[PDB]
Amino acid sequence: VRAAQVEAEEEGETVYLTLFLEWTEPKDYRVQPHMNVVVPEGARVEAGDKIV
Amino acid sequence: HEIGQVPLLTLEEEVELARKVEEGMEAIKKLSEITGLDPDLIREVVRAKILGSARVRHIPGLKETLDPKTVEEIDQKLKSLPKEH
DNA sequence: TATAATGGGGGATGCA
């Protein structure tokens, strides 16, 4: 995970950080023999795109 | 010995090849719709270009005689289609 | 037309 924009607010002896974070959550799919993978390696997909 | 050279298909490879065949059939079925020609002729030209130049003959059932000239004309008419066609 | 089946059963002489 990386932090895009990092804001902050000075309060008393502490700081409140407003972070804009970005990352990737892996999800494992199991493929069956009768199925066919129709998406290449490292392909940028969106919501609804058919993978298999 | 000539038969023991081609490996035995795995289930996955089997389904793969079969699927590709069926998809090819449908693809030609729509290509004929696009070009407004003949399915048998088209699939025969595809067969021709696939197998190479070793096999070229007039197929009993097809109206046009399949000589390299004609298959060149048809293949050039196949290259004259939009990316989605 | 659709369980799955995938590799068989002598005898001598001329010529390359």
PDB file of C-alpha atoms (C1' of nucleotides) in Angstrom:
ATOM      1  CA  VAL A   1       0.000   0.000   0.000  1.00  0.00           C
ATOM      2  CA  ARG A   2       1.165   3.503  -0.959  1.00  0.00           C
ATOM      3  CA  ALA A   3       0.036   6.954   0.210  1.00  0.00           C
ATOM      4  CA  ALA A   4      -0.954   9.451  -2.492  1.00  0.00           C
ATOM      5  CA  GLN A   5      -1.845  12.700  -0.727  1.00  0.00           C
ATOM      6  CA  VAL A   6      -0.847  13.114   2.920  1.00  0.00           C
ATOM      7  CA  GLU A   7      -2.479  15.901   4.929  1.00  0.00           C
ATOM      8  CA  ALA A   8      -2.146  16.653   8.643  1.00  0.00           C
ATOM      9  CA  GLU A   9      -3.579  18.739  11.482  1.00  0.00           C
ATOM     10  CA  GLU A  10      -1.692  20.031  14.524  1.00  0.00           C
ATOM     11  CA  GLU A  11      -3.693  19.435  17.711  1.00  0.00           C
ATOM     12  CA  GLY A  12      -2.139  19.899  21.148  1.00  0.00           C
ATOM     13  CA  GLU A  13       0.934  17.678  21.268  1.00  0.00           C
ATOM     14  CA  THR A  14      -0.312  15.389  18.504  1.00  0.00           C
ATOM     15  CA  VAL A  15      -1.107  15.319  14.783  1.00  0.00           C
ATOM     16  CA  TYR A  16      -4.103  13.935  12.899  1.00  0.00           C
ATOM     17  CA  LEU A  17      -3.066  12.525   9.525  1.00  0.00           C
ATOM     18  CA  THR A  18      -5.445  12.449   6.559  1.00  0.00           C
ATOM     19  CA  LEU A  19      -4.122   9.737   4.246  1.00  0.00           C
ATOM     20  CA  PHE A  20      -5.132   8.878   0.681  1.00  0.00           C
ATOM     21  CA  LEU A  21      -4.136   5.221   0.442  1.00  0.00           C
ATOM     22  CA  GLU A  22      -3.946   2.907  -2.578  1.00  0.00           C
ATOM     23  CA  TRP A  23      -3.304  -0.846  -2.696  1.00  0.00           C
ATOM     24  CA  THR A  24      -4.188  -4.240  -4.170  1.00  0.00           C
ATOM     25  CA  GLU A  25      -6.182  -7.044  -2.539  1.00  0.00           C
ATOM     26  CA  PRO A  26      -5.552 -10.497  -4.073  1.00  0.00           C
ATOM     27  CA  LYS A  27      -8.446 -12.902  -4.653  1.00  0.00           C
ATOM     28  CA  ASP A  28      -7.896 -16.538  -5.622  1.00  0.00           C
ATOM     29  CA  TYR A  29     -10.140 -18.193  -8.205  1.00  0.00           C
ATOM     30  CA  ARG A  30     -10.035 -21.929  -8.914  1.00  0.00           C
ATOM     31  CA  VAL A  31     -10.334 -22.961 -12.564  1.00  0.00           C
ATOM     32  CA  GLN A  32     -12.022 -26.165 -13.729  1.00  0.00           C
ATOM     33  CA  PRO A  33     -10.934 -28.156 -16.840  1.00  0.00           C
ATOM     34  CA  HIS A  34     -14.150 -27.373 -18.751  1.00  0.00           C
ATOM     35  CA  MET A  35     -13.512 -23.658 -18.216  1.00  0.00           C
ATOM     36  CA  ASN A  36     -11.372 -21.350 -20.356  1.00  0.00           C
ATOM     37  CA  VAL A  37      -9.283 -18.402 -19.163  1.00  0.00           C
ATOM     38  CA  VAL A  38      -9.953 -15.548 -21.591  1.00  0.00           C
ATOM     39  CA  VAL A  39      -7.820 -12.910 -19.850  1.00  0.00           C
ATOM     40  CA  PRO A  40      -4.005 -12.550 -20.176  1.00  0.00           C
ATOM     41  CA  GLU A  41      -1.326 -12.013 -17.515  1.00  0.00           C
ATOM     42  CA  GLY A  42      -1.310  -8.585 -15.876  1.00  0.00           C
ATOM     43  CA  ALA A  43      -4.426  -7.477 -17.736  1.00  0.00           C
ATOM     44  CA  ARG A  44      -6.113  -4.395 -16.289  1.00  0.00           C
ATOM     45  CA  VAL A  45      -9.777  -5.294 -15.840  1.00  0.00           C
ATOM     46  CA  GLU A  46     -12.804  -3.391 -14.550  1.00  0.00           C
ATOM     47  CA  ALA A  47     -16.093  -4.283 -12.856  1.00  0.00           C
ATOM     48  CA  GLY A  48     -18.052  -6.780 -14.945  1.00  0.00           C
ATOM     49  CA  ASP A  49     -15.262  -7.904 -17.269  1.00  0.00           C
ATOM     50  CA  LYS A  50     -15.172 -11.648 -17.935  1.00  0.00           C
ATOM     51  CA  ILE A  51     -11.996 -13.329 -16.695  1.00  0.00           C
ATOM     52  CA  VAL A  52     -12.932 -16.992 -17.174  1.00  0.00           C
TER      53      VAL A  52
ATOM     54  CA  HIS B   1       4.892 -45.554 -35.240  1.00  0.00           C
ATOM     55  CA  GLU B   2       3.461 -42.554 -37.091  1.00  0.00           C
ATOM     56  CA  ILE B   3       0.508 -42.594 -34.689  1.00  0.00           C
ATOM     57  CA  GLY B   4       2.685 -42.738 -31.576  1.00  0.00           C
ATOM     58  CA  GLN B   5       4.216 -39.360 -32.386  1.00  0.00           C
ATOM     59  CA  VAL B   6       1.133 -37.230 -31.755  1.00  0.00           C
ATOM     60  CA  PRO B   7       0.689 -37.132 -27.951  1.00  0.00           C
ATOM     61  CA  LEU B   8      -2.507 -38.101 -26.125  1.00  0.00           C
ATOM     62  CA  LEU B   9      -4.771 -35.184 -25.223  1.00  0.00           C
ATOM     63  CA  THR B  10      -5.341 -34.109 -21.644  1.00  0.00           C
ATOM     64  CA  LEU B  11      -8.970 -33.355 -20.746  1.00  0.00           C
ATOM     65  CA  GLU B  12      -8.137 -29.644 -20.721  1.00  0.00           C
ATOM     66  CA  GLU B  13      -6.437 -29.756 -24.135  1.00  0.00           C
ATOM     67  CA  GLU B  14      -9.292 -31.876 -25.484  1.00  0.00           C
ATOM     68  CA  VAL B  15     -11.962 -29.385 -24.407  1.00  0.00           C
ATOM     69  CA  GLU B  16      -9.706 -26.580 -25.662  1.00  0.00           C
ATOM     70  CA  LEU B  17      -9.406 -27.987 -29.183  1.00  0.00           C
ATOM     71  CA  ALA B  18     -13.097 -28.918 -29.392  1.00  0.00           C
ATOM     72  CA  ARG B  19     -14.141 -25.456 -28.191  1.00  0.00           C
ATOM     73  CA  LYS B  20     -11.841 -23.817 -30.739  1.00  0.00           C
ATOM     74  CA  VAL B  21     -13.389 -25.953 -33.492  1.00  0.00           C
ATOM     75  CA  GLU B  22     -16.968 -25.044 -32.564  1.00  0.00           C
ATOM     76  CA  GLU B  23     -16.018 -21.369 -32.236  1.00  0.00           C
ATOM     77  CA  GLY B  24     -14.479 -21.603 -35.700  1.00  0.00           C
ATOM     78  CA  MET B  25     -17.693 -23.050 -37.106  1.00  0.00           C
ATOM     79  CA  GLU B  26     -19.778 -20.233 -35.624  1.00  0.00           C
ATOM     80  CA  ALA B  27     -17.200 -17.669 -36.768  1.00  0.00           C
ATOM     81  CA  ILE B  28     -17.542 -18.857 -40.357  1.00  0.00           C
ATOM     82  CA  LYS B  29     -21.326 -18.942 -39.920  1.00  0.00           C
ATOM     83  CA  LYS B  30     -21.186 -15.209 -39.170  1.00  0.00           C
ATOM     84  CA  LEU B  31     -18.457 -14.418 -41.709  1.00  0.00           C
ATOM     85  CA  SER B  32     -20.796 -15.673 -44.424  1.00  0.00           C
ATOM     86  CA  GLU B  33     -23.416 -13.270 -43.049  1.00  0.00           C
ATOM     87  CA  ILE B  34     -20.932 -10.403 -43.272  1.00  0.00           C
ATOM     88  CA  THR B  35     -19.514 -11.124 -46.734  1.00  0.00           C
ATOM     89  CA  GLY B  36     -22.782 -12.446 -48.162  1.00  0.00           C
ATOM     90  CA  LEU B  37     -21.070 -15.413 -49.796  1.00  0.00           C
ATOM     91  CA  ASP B  38     -21.025 -19.165 -49.142  1.00  0.00           C
ATOM     92  CA  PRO B  39     -20.141 -20.872 -45.811  1.00  0.00           C
ATOM     93  CA  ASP B  40     -18.702 -24.001 -47.444  1.00  0.00           C
ATOM     94  CA  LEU B  41     -16.571 -21.894 -49.786  1.00  0.00           C
ATOM     95  CA  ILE B  42     -15.291 -19.701 -46.952  1.00  0.00           C
ATOM     96  CA  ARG B  43     -14.433 -22.615 -44.659  1.00  0.00           C
ATOM     97  CA  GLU B  44     -12.756 -24.306 -47.625  1.00  0.00           C
ATOM     98  CA  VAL B  45     -10.593 -21.231 -48.237  1.00  0.00           C
ATOM     99  CA  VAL B  46      -9.700 -21.092 -44.541  1.00  0.00           C
ATOM    100  CA  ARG B  47      -8.824 -24.793 -44.761  1.00  0.00           C
ATOM    101  CA  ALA B  48      -6.705 -24.024 -47.820  1.00  0.00           C
ATOM    102  CA  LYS B  49      -4.687 -21.291 -46.111  1.00  0.00           C
ATOM    103  CA  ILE B  50      -4.339 -23.426 -42.974  1.00  0.00           C
ATOM    104  CA  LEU B  51      -3.030 -26.572 -44.679  1.00  0.00           C
ATOM    105  CA  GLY B  52      -0.713 -24.560 -46.926  1.00  0.00           C
ATOM    106  CA  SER B  53      -0.163 -24.761 -50.676  1.00  0.00           C
ATOM    107  CA  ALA B  54       0.233 -28.541 -50.790  1.00  0.00           C
ATOM    108  CA  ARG B  55      -3.508 -29.173 -51.072  1.00  0.00           C
ATOM    109  CA  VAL B  56      -5.535 -27.199 -53.621  1.00  0.00           C
ATOM    110  CA  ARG B  57      -8.412 -28.734 -55.588  1.00  0.00           C
ATOM    111  CA  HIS B  58     -11.985 -28.070 -56.701  1.00  0.00           C
ATOM    112  CA  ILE B  59     -14.306 -29.502 -54.050  1.00  0.00           C
ATOM    113  CA  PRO B  60     -17.435 -31.304 -55.346  1.00  0.00           C
ATOM    114  CA  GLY B  61     -20.253 -29.204 -53.905  1.00  0.00           C
ATOM    115  CA  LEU B  62     -18.614 -25.792 -54.126  1.00  0.00           C
ATOM    116  CA  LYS B  63     -19.716 -23.647 -57.067  1.00  0.00           C
ATOM    117  CA  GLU B  64     -16.374 -21.906 -57.633  1.00  0.00           C
ATOM    118  CA  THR B  65     -13.250 -23.790 -58.715  1.00  0.00           C
ATOM    119  CA  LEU B  66     -10.580 -23.492 -56.020  1.00  0.00           C
ATOM    120  CA  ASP B  67      -7.396 -22.333 -57.736  1.00  0.00           C
ATOM    121  CA  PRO B  68      -4.724 -20.192 -55.975  1.00  0.00           C
ATOM    122  CA  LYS B  69      -5.934 -17.163 -57.963  1.00  0.00           C
ATOM    123  CA  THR B  70      -9.505 -17.377 -56.671  1.00  0.00           C
ATOM    124  CA  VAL B  71      -8.437 -18.191 -53.111  1.00  0.00           C
ATOM    125  CA  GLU B  72      -6.148 -15.158 -53.324  1.00  0.00           C
ATOM    126  CA  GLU B  73      -9.070 -12.968 -54.386  1.00  0.00           C
ATOM    127  CA  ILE B  74     -11.216 -14.327 -51.546  1.00  0.00           C
ATOM    128  CA  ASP B  75      -8.382 -14.034 -49.010  1.00  0.00           C
ATOM    129  CA  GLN B  76      -7.891 -10.411 -50.065  1.00  0.00           C
ATOM    130  CA  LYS B  77     -11.628  -9.882 -49.629  1.00  0.00           C
ATOM    131  CA  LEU B  78     -11.203 -11.358 -46.150  1.00  0.00           C
ATOM    132  CA  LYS B  79      -8.464  -8.847 -45.354  1.00  0.00           C
ATOM    133  CA  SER B  80     -10.809  -6.078 -46.497  1.00  0.00           C
ATOM    134  CA  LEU B  81     -12.923  -6.243 -43.337  1.00  0.00           C
ATOM    135  CA  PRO B  82     -13.047  -3.954 -40.261  1.00  0.00           C
ATOM    136  CA  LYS B  83     -11.213  -5.048 -37.098  1.00  0.00           C
ATOM    137  CA  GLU B  84     -14.437  -6.312 -35.499  1.00  0.00           C
ATOM    138  CA  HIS B  85     -15.364  -8.119 -38.723  1.00  0.00           C
TER     139      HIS B  85
ATOM    140  C1'  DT C   1     -25.680 -39.600 -32.939  1.00  0.00           C
ATOM    141  C1'  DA C   2     -23.203 -38.581 -26.293  1.00  0.00           C
ATOM    142  C1'  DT C   3     -20.905 -43.682 -19.507  1.00  0.00           C
ATOM    143  C1'  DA C   4     -15.827 -44.491 -21.165  1.00  0.00           C
ATOM    144  C1'  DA C   5     -13.029 -46.554 -24.561  1.00  0.00           C
ATOM    145  C1'  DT C   6      -6.810 -43.900 -27.702  1.00  0.00           C
ATOM    146  C1'  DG C   7       0.078 -48.300 -30.772  1.00  0.00           C
ATOM    147  C1'  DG C   8      -1.453 -55.711 -34.335  1.00  0.00           C
ATOM    148  C1'  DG C   9      -1.026 -60.813 -34.485  1.00  0.00           C
ATOM    149  C1'  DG C  10      16.870 -76.942 -51.684  1.00  0.00           C
ATOM    150  C1'  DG C  11      20.460 -75.134 -54.867  1.00  0.00           C
ATOM    151  C1'  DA C  12      22.962 -72.936 -57.753  1.00  0.00           C
ATOM    152  C1'  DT C  13      23.979 -68.727 -60.281  1.00  0.00           C
ATOM    153  C1'  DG C  14      24.115 -63.950 -61.690  1.00  0.00           C
ATOM    154  C1'  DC C  15      24.673 -59.295 -60.119  1.00  0.00           C
ATOM    155  C1'  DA C  16      25.010 -54.591 -56.441  1.00  0.00           C
TER     156       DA C  16
END
